[PDB]
Amino acid sequence: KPLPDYVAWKDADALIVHSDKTLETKRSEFGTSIITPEEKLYIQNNVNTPPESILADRDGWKVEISGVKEPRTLTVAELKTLGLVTAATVLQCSGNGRKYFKDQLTGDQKMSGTPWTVGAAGCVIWSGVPLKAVVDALGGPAEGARFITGTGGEELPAGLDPKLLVVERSVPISNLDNVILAWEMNGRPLSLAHGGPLRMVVPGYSGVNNIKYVKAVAMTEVETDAKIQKTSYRVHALGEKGSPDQPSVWEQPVKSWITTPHEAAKAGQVQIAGVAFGGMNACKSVEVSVDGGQTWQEAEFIGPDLGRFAWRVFALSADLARGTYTLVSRATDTEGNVQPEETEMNGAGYGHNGWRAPAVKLTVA
Amino acid sequence: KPLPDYVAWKDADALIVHSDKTLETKRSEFGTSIITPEEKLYIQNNVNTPPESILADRDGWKVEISGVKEPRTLTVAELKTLGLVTAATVLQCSGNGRKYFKDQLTGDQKMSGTPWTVGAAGCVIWSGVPLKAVVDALGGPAEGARFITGTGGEELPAGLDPKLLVVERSVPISNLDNVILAWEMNGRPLSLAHGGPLRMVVPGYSGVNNIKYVKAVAMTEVETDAKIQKTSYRVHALGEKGSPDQPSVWEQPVKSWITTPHEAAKAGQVQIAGVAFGGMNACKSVEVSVDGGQTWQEAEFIGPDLGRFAWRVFALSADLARGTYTLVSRATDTEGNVQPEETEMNGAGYGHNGWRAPAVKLTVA
Ligand code: MSS
Numbered sequence: 039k040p041l042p043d044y045v046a047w048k049d050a051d052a053l054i055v056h057s058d059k060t061l062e063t064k065r066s067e068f069g070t071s072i073i074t075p076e077e078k079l080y081i082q083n084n085v086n087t088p089p090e091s092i093l094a095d096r097d098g099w100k101v102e103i104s105g106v107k108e109p110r111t112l113t114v115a116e117l118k119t120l121g122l123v124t125a126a127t128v129l130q131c132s133g134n135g136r137k138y139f140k141d142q143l144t145g146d147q148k149m150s151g152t153p154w155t156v157g158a159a160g161c162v163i164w165s166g167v168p169l170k171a172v173v174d175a176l177g178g179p180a181e182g183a184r185f186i187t188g189t190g191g192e193e194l195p196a197g198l199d200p201k202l203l204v205v206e207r208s209v210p211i212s213n214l215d216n217v218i219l220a221w222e223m224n225g226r227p228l229s230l231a232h233g234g235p236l237r238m239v240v241p242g243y244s245g246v247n248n249i250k251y252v253k254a255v256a257m258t259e260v261e262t263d264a265k266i267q268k269t270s271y272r273v274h275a276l277g278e279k280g281s282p283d284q285p286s287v288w289e290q291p292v293k294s295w296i297t298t299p300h301e302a303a304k305a306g307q308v309q310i311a312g313v314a315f316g317g318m319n320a321c322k323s324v325e326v327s328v329d330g331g332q333t334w335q336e337a338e339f340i341g342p343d344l345g346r347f348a349w350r351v352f353a354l355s356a357d358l359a360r361g362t363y364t365l366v367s368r369a370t371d372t373e374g375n376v377q378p379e380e381t382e383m384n385g386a387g388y389g390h391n392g393w394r395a396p397a398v399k400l401t402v403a
Numbered sequence: 404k405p406l407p408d409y410v411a412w413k414d415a416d417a418l419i420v421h422s423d424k425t426l427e428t429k430r431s432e433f434g435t436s437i438i439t440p441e442e443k444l445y446i447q448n449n450v451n452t453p454p455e456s457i458l459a460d461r462d463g464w465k466v467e468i469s470g471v472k473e474p475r476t477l478t479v480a481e482l483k484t485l486g487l488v489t490a491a492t493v494l495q496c497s498g499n500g501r502k503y504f505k506d507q508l509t510g511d512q513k514m515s516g517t518p519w520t521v522g523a524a525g526c527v528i529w530s531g532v533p534l535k536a537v538v539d540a541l542g543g544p545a546e547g548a549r550f551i552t553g554t555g556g557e558e559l560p561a562g563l564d565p566k567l568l569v570v571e572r573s574v575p576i577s578n579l580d581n582v583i584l585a586w587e588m589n590g591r592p593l594s595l596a597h598g599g600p601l602r603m604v605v606p607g608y609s610g611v612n613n614i615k616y617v618k619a620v621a622m623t624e625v626e627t628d629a630k631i632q633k634t635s636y637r638v639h640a641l642g643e644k645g646s647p648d649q650p651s652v653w654e655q656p657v658k659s660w661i662t663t664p665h666e667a668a669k670a671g672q673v674q675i676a677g678v679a680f681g682g683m684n685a686c687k688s689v690e691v692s693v694d695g696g697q698t699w700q701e702a703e704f705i706g707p708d709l710g711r712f713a714w715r716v717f718a719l720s721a722d723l724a725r726g727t728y729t730l731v732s733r734a735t736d737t738e739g740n741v742q743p744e745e746t747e748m749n750g751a752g753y754g755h756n757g758w759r760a761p762a763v764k765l766t767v768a
């Protein structure tokens with residue numbers, strides 16, 4: 039219930055403490071300014087957070103760059119000379135909406151993992167050096183490179199096989215132009231809790247791929263065979279083990295949810311709003327419904343457009359009689375991908391994006 | 404020197420404490436994410452802050468709306484029912500850059516006021532209700548209304564004359580479509596120190612016009628004859644008193660400044676960056692010089708475009724020999740307005756937008 043000390047600075051009234059590695063943002067804390075307040079942003083760690091000592095000398099933090107023509111270790115100071123890129127993305131856990139999959143379980147069916155609803159997601163602005171700039175300074179990728187492979191900086195238990203625990207992820211090299219090595223989040227030096235001193239940011243991809251405290255970036259011909267790539271974070275059926283032939287949780291699908299009002303309103307005029315994104319694509323439109331998706335209304339976007347990888351705020355002005363309403367939203371991206379009512383089951387419960395399950399029940403009085 | 408209780412949450416290391424009413428953002432603290440961190444945003448109050456008990460019931464805060472067909476006092480709760488808007492604006496004090504006017508003084512020429520350099524400015528995201536929507540809900544503005552007149556909510560000392568102390572400002576009614584009554588900034592409820600529970604935000608206008616803790620908004624045929632509107636905050640010549648025939652500090656002029664590197668760097672590639680806006684218009688382009696304005700090069704914009712009232716981060720990658728450089732930026736807006744080298748003198752020291760004076764001395768080692 040209380041905050042662990044690596045996130046003592048965070049807002050405890052805005053957060054569900056699932057565990058010391060896992061804090062969820064309450065649905066009524068998102069705001070309507072697009073950007074998620076740092077002190078309310080969700081936390082999800084696969085392993086323990088490093089000590090705060092790694093932030094003592096942020097410019098001295100080292101990144102080994104390999105799979106390029108002139109491989110070498112670059113400090114953050116050095117990276118700060120190579121370029122500057124700023125971009126807003128949706129950082130969302132692949133598990134976000136796992137609760138809703140658990141709700142579809144029947145008989146002897148079981149699913150482990152955090153029962154996230156909507157709160158394992160936030161829209162933030164990163165600043166740093168683009169990966170293309172880093173790779174191009176070292177003579178470009180080695181011929182045959184197919185993947186960008188990032189390695190988390192956590193000290194591993196000297197005892198176990200490191201491939202069992204290391205947070206290492208591999209994404210296609212097509213993402214080279216979007217990837218950022220970010221030292222800054224929302225205009226501040228990146229907190230330890232969200233991956234300081236440097237984090238590999240992979241736009242449009244799921245949370246897991248945005249490697250906190252990145253110490254190595256390799257352009258590689260093969261994905262990492264680390265457990266967290268090979269077998270974990272794989273889309274499979276109920277009762278299947280994860281394996282590297284199945285899709286990995288890479289691109290994020292088109293998705294939205296209602297954020298306000300979360301619970302209660304007076305009868306009359308009500309502003310219904312929430313967040314909507316297309317993952318790799320921009321959100322083009324959101325339809326909103328107050329009767330559980332029986333009747334639909336086009337909503338309008340709110341605030342500026344922060345790019346194809348960020349979310350938009352939407353809103354519908356409703357005039358509601360006294361009753362108990364069922365608020366849902368259905369986003370559509372620029373390529374025509376639209377949220378289904380329910381998301382097809384998968385055993386680990388990754389990538390929920392159905393519109394029915396996250397419905398908000400609104401008592402209008 | 405220390406921080407007063409009402410801004411004890413702010414980052415002491417990021418702020419120069421001119422007084423208990425006046426805190427300036429250090430030039431090294433702007434970041435490159437566009438948005439200015441809440442805890443680093445500048446503070447500037449003409450009179451004392453209200454007690455924080457006014458935030459105890461934010462939704463019960465009352466705003467009298469007059470100069471419309473159906474004049475009425477609305478609570479914030481009610482305002483939340485009438486619409487939703489979100490926008491990024493540059494919040495800048497009309498005093499920002501006064502030190503640079505004070506440097507142009509010769510002989511017996513004095514100038515009072517805070518010697519701000521570049522840190523009485525921030526770019527933030529406001530969320531709230533559009534004033535148009537509030538005004539439409541109450542039948543529209545009265546026939547012949549020519550101004551929006553906002554009254555700050557500070558308790559006035561009894562005995563004294565209200566008009567000598569009240570923070571009340573008028574802007575032309577042409578701003579109706581842009582004006583927001585904001586309960587939220589950067590995704591959080593608005594802090595007391597930045598005008599919570601409700602602030603009248605006037606995009607593209609100098610800071611004084613953005614009325615904190617707004618308790619009345621009136622569509623008026625004349626400007627308020629309050630002191631702060633009538634004589635204060637007027638562009639007049641060195642030696643003159645202020646008077647209402649003269650231009651008020653309304654629309655912000657085209658402007659930019661370098662924010663990084665602030666002091667030092669190493670020989671070789673150096674990423675020079677800053678912020679740039681057109682006030683009422685977007686920034687179209689920015690040129691940067693390393694030799695005090697002898698040679699210019701086109702910079703490129705960094706991060707998303709947050710709209711016409713916000714600022715763009717810009718950057719220029721330059722390759723530098725060891726030496727002492729003089730970093731300047733010159734911004735152009737969408738209608739062809741460029742920054743001048745120096746700004747024409749005015750007695751109060753308002754509206755400096757010159758490129759020579761805010762120059763950064765870079766020691767490239
Ligand atoms: N280094 C590292 N990184 C990393 C990790 C760990 O553990 N480690 N986790 C993941 C995940 S998985 Mo699921 O797909 S979600 C997620 C994310 C989150 O983030 P924040 O905490 O910042 O929010 O992160 C990411 N990264």
Ligand code: MSS
Pocket residue numbers: 444445446447448449450494495496497498554555556557570596597598609610611612613614615616652
């Ligand atoms: N109510 C009120 N409001 C108000 C005031 C006062 O005093 N009061 N001030 C002004 C000014 S002036 Mo010169 O032009 S700048 C400015 C601004 C600032 O804000 P922040 O503090 O938030 O930053 O505010 C504005 N508003």
